[PDB]
Amino acid sequence: GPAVGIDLGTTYSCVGVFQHGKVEIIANDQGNRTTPSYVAFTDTERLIGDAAKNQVAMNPTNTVFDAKRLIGRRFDDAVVQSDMKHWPFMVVNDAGRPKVQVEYKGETKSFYPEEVSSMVLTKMKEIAEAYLGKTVTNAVVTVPAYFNDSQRQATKDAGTIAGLNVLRIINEPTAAAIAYGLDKKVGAERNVLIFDLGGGTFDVSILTIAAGIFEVKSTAGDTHLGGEDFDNRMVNHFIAEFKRKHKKDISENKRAVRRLRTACERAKRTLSSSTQASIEIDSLYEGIDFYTSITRARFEELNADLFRGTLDPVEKALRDAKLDKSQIHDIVLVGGSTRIPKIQKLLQDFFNGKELNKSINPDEAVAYGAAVQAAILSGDVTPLSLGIETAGGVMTVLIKRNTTIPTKQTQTFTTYSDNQPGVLIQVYEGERAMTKDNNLLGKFELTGIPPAPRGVPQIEVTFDIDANGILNVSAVDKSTGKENKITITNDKGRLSKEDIERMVQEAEKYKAEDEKQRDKVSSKNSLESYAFNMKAT
Ligand code: NA
Numbered sequence: 042g043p044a045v046g047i048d049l050g051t052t053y054s055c056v057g058v059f060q061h062g063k064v065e066i067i068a069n070d071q072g073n074r075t076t077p078s079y080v081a082f083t084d085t086e087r088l089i090g091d092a093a094k095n096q097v098a099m100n101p102t103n104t105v106f107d108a109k110r111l112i113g114r115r116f117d118d119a120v121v122q123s124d125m126k127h128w129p130f131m132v133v134n135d136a137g138r139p140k141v142q143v144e145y146k147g148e149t150k151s152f153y154p155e156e157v158s159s160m161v162l163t164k165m166k167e168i169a170e171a172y173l174g175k176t177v178t179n180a181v182v183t184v185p186a187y188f189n190d191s192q193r194q195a196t197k198d199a200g201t202i203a204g205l206n207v208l209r210i211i212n213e214p215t216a217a218a219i220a221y222g223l224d225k226k227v228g229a230e231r232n233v234l235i236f237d238l239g240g241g242t243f244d245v246s247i248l249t250i251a252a253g254i255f256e257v258k259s260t261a262g263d264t265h266l267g268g269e270d271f272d273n274r275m276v277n278h279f280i281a282e283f284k285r286k287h288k289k290d291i292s293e294n295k296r297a298v299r300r301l302r303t304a305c306e307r308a309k310r311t312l313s314s315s316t317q318a319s320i321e322i323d324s325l326y327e328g329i330d331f332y333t334s335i336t337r338a339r340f341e342e343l344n345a346d347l348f349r350g351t352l353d354p355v356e357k358a359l360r361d362a363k364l365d366k367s368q369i370h371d372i373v374l375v376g377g378s379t380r381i382p383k384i385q386k387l388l389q390d391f392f393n394g395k396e397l398n399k400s401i402n403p404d405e406a407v408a409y410g411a412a413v414q415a416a417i418l419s420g421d422v423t424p425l426s427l428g429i430e431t432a433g434g435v436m437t438v439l440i441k442r443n444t445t446i447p448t449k450q451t452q453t454f455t456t457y458s459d460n461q462p463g464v465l466i467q468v469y470e471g472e473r474a475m476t477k478d479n480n481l482l483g484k485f486e487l488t489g490i491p492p493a494p495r496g497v498p499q500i501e502v503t504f505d506i507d508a509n510g511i512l513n514v515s516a517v518d519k520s521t522g523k524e525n526k527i528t529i530t531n532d533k534g535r536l537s538k539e540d541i542e543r544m545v546q547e548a549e550k551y552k553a554e555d556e557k558q559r560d561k562v563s564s565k566n567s568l569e570s571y572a573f574n575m576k577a578t
Contacts, residue, residue, distance in 0.1 A: 044179030044208060044419040045169045046411025048216070049158060049196065051109045052240035052267070054078050055405055056165040057412035058173065064220075064412045066405045067172040069164075075404050076168065080105045080160045082145035089164040098299060101129035103143040107241075108161075110264075111139045111154035112199070113192030120264075155195045159202035166203055180205040181415040183407050186212040186246050186257045190550070208418045213237065214246035215255045216410030217375045221398050224253050229422065230443040231370040232258070234358070236388060238351065238378035241267035245354040247362040247369075251422050251443035254541055256472075257549045259361035261354035266347065268309070268378040274343040275305035275335065279320065283331060291326040300325060312337045313380040341383045348383050352391055366392055374399040375406050421446050424541050427504055427512065430467040430476045432457040433562045434573030439504045442472065442545075446510060451503045453519070455496050457567035463488035464500055464568035466516045468529060472548035474555035477574050483527045484572070487516045500568060 046064075048055040053075040057066045066074045071091050081093035082103040088096065097104045110124050116134040125132045131142040133151060140151040162182070169177040182205075184196050193210045200207040214235035218224065223233055230251040237244040243266040247259040279301050284290050291297040300322055308318035316337050325331040341348065359366060374397050378384065389397060401409055422445055428438040431454070439450045456464065464487050471479030490498050499519035506512050510531035517524040548555065 042173060042175045042177065044181065044415035045166075045177050046181045046183075046216070046408050046413070046415045047162065047165050047200075048183050048213070048405075048407040048411060049109065049161065049165075049199070050075075050078055050239065050407075051107060051242055052078060052269075053404070054161050054165055055408035056169050057405065057408040058169060059412045059416035064409045065172075066402070066408060067168050069168045070171075074402075076161070076164060078106060078109065078158075078161045080108075080157050082143040082150065084144075084146060087145065087160070089160050098295070103130070103145070105130050105141050105143065105152075105157050108141070108154045108157035111141075112158060113189065113195035114139065114154075155199040156202060158196065158199035162199055162203035162205060166205060178204065178206050179208055179415065179419055181209050181211055181411045181418065182207050183213045183216045183411050184210055185242075185244060186214050186549075187244075187260045208415065211411065211414055212246070212255075212257060213375070213407045214244070214248055214257070214373075216407045216414065217373050218248060218250065218255065218371075219410035219413050220401050220406045221371070221373055223250055223371055223373075224255070226250070229445060232362070232364055232368050233371040233373060234355065234369050235373045235375060236351075236355070236379060237262075237375040238384065239267055239376040240269055240378070241265070243267065243351060243354065244375075245358045247358050247364065249443070252424070252541075253538060254443075254545060256545050258364070259358040261358040261361065263350075263354065266350070268306075268376075270347055271309055271340075271344050271378065271381070272302060272305045274347070275308065275340065276302050278335075278339075278343055279305065279331070279333070282333065283326065283329075287327070287329050289326055289329070294326060297326050301331075308335055309340065309381075312340050313382065337382070344383075348381070348387060351384060352387060355388070355391065369395070372397050373406070374403050377404050379403045421508070421510070423448075423506070424536055425470040425480075425544060426472055427468070427470055427482075427506075428479075429454075429502060429514075429568070430465075430469060430573060431562065431565060432567040432569050432573075434476050435558065435562055435565075436469055436471065436474055436476050436479050437565055439502065440506065446506045447508050449503065449505045451501055452566070454500045454502055454566045454568045455564070456490065456493070456498045456500075457495060457564070457569050459495050460492040461490060461495070461498070461570055462492075463490055463570050464516070465570055465572065466502060466514065466525075466527075466568070467572060468512070468514050468527065471544055473544075473551065474558040478547070478551075481574075482512070482529045483514070485514070485516070485525050485527045487518060487523070487525050489521070489523055490518060491520055496564070496567075 046057045076090040077094040079093035081088035116139040197207045233248045235246040244262040249256045304320045311318040320333045322331040422443045426438045426442045427440040431437040467484045468482040469476045469479040501517045503515045512529040515526040
């Protein structure tokens, strides 16, 4: 049977299947295409999904949510320590691992974050099985791009516990791009910004896509910004309005606040499609009916700081990606909060009128991409950056990856040491800062450099790639015209698509460490006479 794509979200989860040439997002028992990531433990039963969320007020201690925040993390993590304070449920330390502790059937029980996530995955698997009419085993599960190897493995383990064979763990921004088919664009590399504003988290991701290959250039956002925050601003405003009108604070009554919050969430949805919404609550407090209205403009004023603040992570991501806003080719909206008209206007105005990709339901786009990838697994540009080793074993790129062929790139280099007799030209392929982490393709020596102080001799290195992809690397001593060259054959099938993806992924994993290595050397054009990788120490 077909594999399924699952968006394991912090607040809500979504499951989709690619069948008959089309992705179908699967509705649950109550007809909802999204299922709350909530598990509830009671004296009589365990509830997953809408049932768990509906009874949260009655059983807060035994209702678990935000397990994604704890997944793949140590208990001593500061995020876990700060996050634990907000949650009613208890978090405990077992062998350096956080666990949720709850009372189920009168017995204290402890579950690893992956175990709670496995229960949400079990419900999504059952939702898929009811729709398909067949057992579902294979799945593609999505995770935030910033997730580390531990967080990804823990998410895979949650699927394994649920009985799912997790074919691959893919980034949520990449899944959204796959849903819009940005990989199938016939032109040269494209820079894509994924603006993801969910119920509880805000994620901005910049990706570069060429030849079906995705690279995460930058990530930015707020882990604590979401639609619920917009609802809270409306609730606080209404509490103030009631207090001004009736001289009473409804904050004391928990149910009254819950009823107001429910009305505010409905009003916010109405405000996305209409310019005004009505709040009608009978007997909100002390028998006083609350009948009032809110304009879209008032809602925008209440959330003005939060809405404008979304641009700040966009600016940071662009700086980290070393890209100007003009260089973004595609913008994708993900998450329900992206429906808000003010958010769309602010992003479009920031991008100078650029159209936004919002045709796919923002709540379902990540699951849609996961479903497309699951089906693919179920059934001329340069592949890698090309460069030479500079002093310190550093990779200096002459031809960037995704460069159209044929191409010729020339750079000038100098000696690192005084009276250096020769330079060793070492050709490497890869996206890592250091040649040790890249692949050596060939080496040649240019000798007879006239004795001179360091930084004075000029050596022009040229990389020439023909249409067939054969690489010719040449070095000329500018003082004498003396030259040496190597021809590197293009071996067919040497590199698979997966091989390129692994090398790009490795660069994403070590980007912070790699940048520090780049900053270490004062000169970027200095060549030594030896191979740094073969040096002792
Ligand atoms: Na999401």
